[PDB]
Amino acid sequence: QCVKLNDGHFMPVLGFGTYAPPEVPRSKALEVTKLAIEAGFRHIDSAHLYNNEEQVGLAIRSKIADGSVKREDIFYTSKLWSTFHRPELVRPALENSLKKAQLDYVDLYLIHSPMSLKPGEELSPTDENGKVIFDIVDLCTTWEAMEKCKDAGLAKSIGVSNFNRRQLEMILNKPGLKYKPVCNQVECHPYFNRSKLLDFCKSKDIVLVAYSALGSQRDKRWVDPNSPVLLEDPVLCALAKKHKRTPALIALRYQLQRGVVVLAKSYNEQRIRQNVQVFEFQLTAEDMKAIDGLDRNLHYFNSDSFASHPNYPY
Numbered sequence: 001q002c003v004k005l006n007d008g009h010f011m012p013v014l015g016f017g018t019y020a021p022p023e024v025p026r027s028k029a030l031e032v033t034k035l036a037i038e039a040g041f042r043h044i045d046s047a048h049l050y051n052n053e054e055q056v057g058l059a060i061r062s063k064i065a066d067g068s069v070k071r072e073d074i075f076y077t078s079k080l081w082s083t084f085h086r087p088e089l090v091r092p093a094l095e096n097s098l099k100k101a102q103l104d105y106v107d108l109y110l111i112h113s114p115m116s117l118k119p120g121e122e123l124s125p126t127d128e129n130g131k132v133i134f135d136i137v138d139l140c141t142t143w144e145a146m147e148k149c150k151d152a153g154l155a156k157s158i159g160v161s162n163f164n165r166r167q168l169e170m171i172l173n174k175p176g177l178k179y180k181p182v183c184n185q186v187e188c189h190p191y192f193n194r195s196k197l198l199d200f201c202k203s204k205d206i207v208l209v210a211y212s213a214l215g216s217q218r219d220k221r222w223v224d225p226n227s228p229v230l231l232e233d234p235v236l237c238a239l240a241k242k243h244k245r246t247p248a249l250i251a252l253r254y255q256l257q258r259g260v261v262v263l264a265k266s267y268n269e270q271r272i273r274q275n276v277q278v279f280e281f282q283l284t285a286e287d288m289k290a291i292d293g294l295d296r297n298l299h300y301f302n303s304d305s306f307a308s309h310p311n312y313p314y
């Protein structure tokens, strides 16, 4: 169950989200990634930011080793963090992510954010006054370093994440371009459905990948507790009763039926197993336009600290 990418390789349309807050013990990312693979996931979304590539790579390496799966069956994804946007820091970051996860290549390497941060070992550098230190980098130079990684064979496909239309065209309107981004991974869910951005990506053979499709983890550091909880929407709860399903399954099927590759994080065995069942039912045209009307342009990620960056995507 995949969608062909604009460089030839294939991406499973349902992916597993591996991020959990640092409060969650690192051993969990190993247990739930194996359970996700046993449940039927073959697309695994990770990143250098999530501090989990060893447990994730170990789980992948262990399911390959016990004979459940082979390396070609697994679509593994990592992301270049924003402190590594200077072109010389790109390949060492990917090799470090490969060394950490113990894989010879990633199926997908993404530019995690367009908001470049100052290079360093800190995932978020902060100055004297406790504010985040930005950095100015021409992102097309970063993409060239990304392109070389695909040539080197460390990344089967390369793409971006949290890129708006203007930032996407900057990559497409790049001189000497060799590989267009196979995908743009952005926040997408019935309350914020990226309809105009999805049309643009469709018009460029670029796959839109939805993160926070279930309505996000609502971490206290980045989300307002008064913001609407997507899985409590009366419309989503109503359709789940009609189809005898769950509100999460309604949200996941919503993206799968408009050409969106959808991610879903879960560290709960039953909900992990519950999410693969999105392929067992279908939404009607009436159900699709009912969810269509829920768009209220709601960013679950909100950060005024990152509102002053020249490349902030929204």
Ligand SMILES: NC(=O)c1ccc[n+]([C@@H]2O[C@H](COP(=O)([O-])OP(=O)(O)OC[C@H]3O[C@@H](n4cnc5c(N)ncnc54)[C@H](OP(=O)(O)O)[C@@H]3O)[C@@H](O)[C@H]2O)c1
Pocket (backbone or CB within 6 Å): 016, 017, 018, 019, 020, 045, 046, 112, 161, 162, 185, 186, 210, 211, 212, 213, 214, 215, 216, 217, 231, 246, 248, 249, 263, 264, 265, 266, 267, 268, 271, 272, 274, 275
């Ligand atoms: N490119 C980027 O900038 C970016 C940003 C954010 C996230 N991501 C990636 O996208 C992945 C998913 O996004 P997300 O972190 O916002 O989480 P999410 O997919 O929106 O899920 C939100 C919450 O819903 C719960 N859940 C999972 N399955 C459920 C089900 N069947 N029914 C009810 N609840 C369910 C989960 O809690 P339980 O664990 O308890 O089940 C989960 O924490 C992340 O893991 C990350 O890899 C990428």
Ligand SMILES: Cc1noc(C)c1COc1ccccc1C(=O)Nc1cccc(Cl)c1
Pocket (backbone or CB within 6 Å): 112, 113, 114, 115, 123, 124, 162, 187, 212, 216, 222, 300, 301, 306, 313
């Ligand atoms: C927009 C956008 N542009 O880049 C990113 C990444 C995003 C979305 O970010 C999130 C979405 C969902 C949940 C969490 C996050 C997040 O934790 N962002 C973050 C941003 C900057 C620094 C650091 Cl440390 C974290």
